Write a protein that binds this ligand. Structure first.
Ligand SMILES: *[C@@H]1O[C@H](CO)[C@@H](O[C@@H]2O[C@H](CO)[C@@H](O)[C@H](O)[C@H]2NC(C)=O)[C@H](O)[C@H]1NC(C)=O
Ligand SMILES: *[C@@H]1O[C@H](CO)[C@@H](O[C@@H]2O[C@H](CO)[C@@H](O)[C@H](O)[C@H]2NC(C)=O)[C@H](O)[C@H]1NC(C)=O
Lengths: 502, 502
């Protein structure tokens, strides 16, 4: 029902051959996009039906570089704009030149933060007749709007049935619904001219009815369809007797909604906030994980890429490789790029040697993502990560992937202890020699139904079956990571150390 | 500006000679009564000017058994009724026969919960002309009014200037201000007939304007002149990044107000509530006072009277004396009544012995109160509580006193280590042989300007001097709990053990 967006931000798809599959997995069934809705480099005739349930986008909506003549975003209602494209635009429609014809954002009626950028769409006909000041929030009138009207297409007139000559398309139902401007009273959203039609303060993007339950969208926090300023607290305060007591109606805060229980792969705080990182002076404990204060001073934590000093660091290099020595859990991500194993003439960074990768021998959990686009050609497997068990995926590469392996010379995967990909997708593609990709029970590693494995251009199964590469005769269910007795997922018989032995 | 309230609840004052002084100390300068405002057994021409600043009563207002002809409450605006007299009345005027002549509650325009009980006042005049349905809040329309109109007065007619014939008194100033039944709209409160004139949804008891600042009283939580559903939480939730952050605007919740720093003698909680007891699985600790969750199960905490199994226990007896064996800190109060030492044949309770009281040797701090109305006649002092340092007074006997000593044969106080009375008053009275009351530095023991020592019917200081029970010379500033060099509060020379030596 809820899903996270992508951080591609106009960059080219890493795997174009599976780009469409990634979007379908990320958005099939999703109603609330907790992030940016980015629809880019989509080919002509692409089946985008999976987008038809999306109602609310938390970040920005970026439609760009597409040849699809239409995008099925009709149900979409509110773009909160909590994250913006170029920092100024909540809806960005760029370089759709085949190409986008009608925006058809019929239900869109609210943009809480940010403007609109429609540029270089030689087939977009009706983007000029929309009165954007109605969609912008009562507190987002600073929203800049830059719309390019240079359209190659001969533009059909706005539909007769449509009023005010404001249309999202040529269809009669493509007519714009003007909520904010119509209000006679000083109310942000109204059903009509009459004062009674005015929506409750909490209501956003219009209300089907006056009561706060009837809002089409929630300004601050949805609660089972009851919009609220703040989620009900886990504990309430008694004014008479100065005591706090548990609240039976208390709910946890997750994104823009109220949840009865903290969703999987998130941390629940004592205040009731479901987060991805623990607050300051708090540590993650298991009871499901929660953030508990470190009454004793917090122990030294190994911070991965994306966190603290390593926030802007692109990859793991010889400069920062020793920072992960002895760390059994990394709060952050690990990325190995081509320049990781080469030297930078400017920054005087020596190349990473394969002997320096053994600092990850004790690594058991990564809270972010594992991204590998380069690997020492000496090593045929990701065996430095053999003792790695969990990739949480709280931080995702490009906003979508938690495990990505690009263009590697490895012959098999060495992640024999990997049991959980908490969140995100797996992208293993263009590894000409990698064989043991389909012998891994990815369904066992995935925790969410949106999660899937995207793979293309690896060593064909034919070649693996032909040259004798397969799971060992002692593997259970033919699940394994490599050619050896030490690479099985589950072993039929009693084990001798790592080795599975009859 | 704030003060607690008494829990006499129509019972006779323990010290009638000092009852009026008790009320003056509790209410002088106070504006918000966090508790019940009980004005009982006041004599004729009693000076009651200290009540003139009271605007808000958190609990109920009880005027009863008084001889004053007028009660000086004229700025009281709201009675929240969180605690009710007999569970049905937020205002009670009973048996004021001198005697009460006019209620004169000119500014009373809101009762959040509870009704009015006016009975047996043979001099009250204008209780009938008031429209009580106006004062009662819309939620509290269930409020039952039981008003007695049996009056032995030929009363001067209601002032013609006063409209609607609703008068709190004979003077033209005493017209009842209508704020709920003169409203053209659905607003709970209104300053005028016009619909624009109604008050904000958080406004209570009326308003001077349309905004939330204007309210005369706050419905839920006052925030420095601003009425809000809740105080700003100490932490706030970021939906984009899915994490909590510290809130500089965050406020601690104290009673019906929101404050920057937790008031003294109150427990701070992580959620931001200033409480008198810690929540479940939370232990008290020094940051001041704070309530921290215990990762391990919290250790065994001794519970005094009024807490847990001893919530309905009146006094410490032989039945429950051994529950305080080895206790260093008692959660609750300690009360020694005549039946504690006499015993109860009905329950087969054995009498307390002086040997049994030694279980308090290790007692250092009492969070509630210390009440002693009986004491063994073989013990000339309170040396059993020699090692007691702090009486917090979070629980107060009759809502006013944290240290009460009445009708005892002790010749001096043995509270050698007593350095702090956190809250409440001290009532030492009718101890004929007690010669060392005034030597003690009560001012250093108190932490509030509300606190004072109420003493009467104790051994006259002239008798003290004549018999020779003067302060020990080696004591400092003439501050001695008792005779001899061991009872000095501060010792001028170096201290040998507990004995001040030359
Ligand atoms: C608040 O959340 C609830 C539950 O997530 C939303 O109710 C759902 O709405 C859509 C309707 O297409 C579907 O996910 C389900 O049919 C509903 N689930 C229920 C009713 O349990 C509700 O719409 C949200 N409120 C707003 C304003 O979006
Ligand atoms: C909210 O609290 C503030 C104080 O924190 C109140 O302001 C005081 O109001 C009293 C009258 O009740 C005055 O005598 C004081 O001089 C005021 N002090 C300050 C600093 O303003 C305020 O009135 C409260 N709000 C309401 C609605 O009662």
């Amino acid at each position: 029902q809820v899903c996270t967006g992508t951080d591609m931000k106009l960059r080219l798809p890493a795997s174009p051959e599976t780009h469409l599959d990634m979007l379908r997995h990320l958005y099939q069934g999703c109603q609330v996009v907790q992030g940016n809705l980015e629809l880019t480099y989509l080919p002509t005739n692409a089946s985008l039906s999976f987008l038809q349930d999306i109602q609310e986008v938390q970040g920005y909506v970026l439609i760009a570089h597409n040849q699809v003549r239409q995008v099925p975003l009709q149900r979409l209602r509110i773009v909160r704009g909590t994250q913006l494209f170029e920092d100024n635009y909540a809806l960005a429609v760029l370089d759709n030149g085949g190409g986008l014809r009608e925006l058809q954002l019929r239900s869109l009626t609210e943009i809480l933060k940010g403007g609109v950028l429609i540029q270089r769409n030689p087939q977009l006909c009706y983007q000029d007749t929309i009165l954007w000041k109605d969609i912008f929030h009562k507190n987002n009138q600073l929203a800049l709007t830059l719309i390019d009207t240079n359209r190659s297409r001969a533009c059909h007139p706005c539909s007769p049935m449509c009023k005010g000559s404001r249309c999202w398309g040529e269809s009669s139902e493509d007519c714009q619904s003007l909520t904010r401007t119509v209000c006679a009273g000083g109310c942000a959203r109204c059903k009509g001219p009459l004062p009674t039609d005015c929506c409750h303060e909490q209501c956003a993007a219009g209300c089907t009815g006056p009561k706060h339950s009837d809002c089409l969208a929630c300004l601050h926090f949805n609660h089972s369809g009851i919009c609220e300023l703040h989620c009900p607290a886990l504990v309430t305060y008694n004014t008479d007797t100065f005591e706090s007591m548990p609240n039976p109606e208390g709910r946890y805060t997750f994104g823009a909604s109220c949840v009865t229980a903290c969703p999987y792969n998130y941390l629940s705080t004592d205040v009731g906030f479901c987060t991805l990182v623990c607050p300051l002076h708090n540590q993650e404990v298991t009871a499901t994980q929660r953030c508990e204060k470190c009454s004793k001073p917090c122990a030294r934590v190994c911070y991965g890429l994306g966190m603290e000093h390593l926030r802007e660091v692109r990859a793991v290099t010889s400069a920062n490789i020793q920072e992960f020595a002895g760390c059994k859990k990394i709060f952050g991500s690990l990325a190995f790029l081509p320049e990781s194993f080469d030297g930078d003439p400017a920054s005087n960074t020596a190349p990473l040697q394969p002997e320096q990768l053994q600092v990850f021998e004790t690594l058991e959990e990564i809270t972010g993502y594992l991204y590998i686009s380069a690997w020492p050609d000496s090593l045929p497997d990701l065996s430095v990560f053999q003792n790695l068990q969990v990739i949480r995926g709280r931080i995702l590469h490009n906003g979508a992937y938690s495990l990505t392996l690009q263009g590697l010379g490895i012959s098999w995967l060495g992640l024999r202890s990997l049991r959980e990909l908490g969140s995100g997708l797996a992208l293993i593609h263009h590894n000409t020699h990698l064989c043991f990709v389909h012998t891994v029970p990815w369904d066992q590693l995935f925790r969410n139904p949106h999660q899937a494995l995207l793979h293309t251009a690896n060593r064909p199964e034919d070649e693996c079956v032909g040259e004798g590469l397969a799971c060992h005769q002692l593997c259970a269910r033919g699940h394994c990571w490599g050619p050896g007795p030490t690479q099985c997922v589950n072993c039929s018989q009693f084990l001798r150390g790592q080795e599975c032995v009859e």
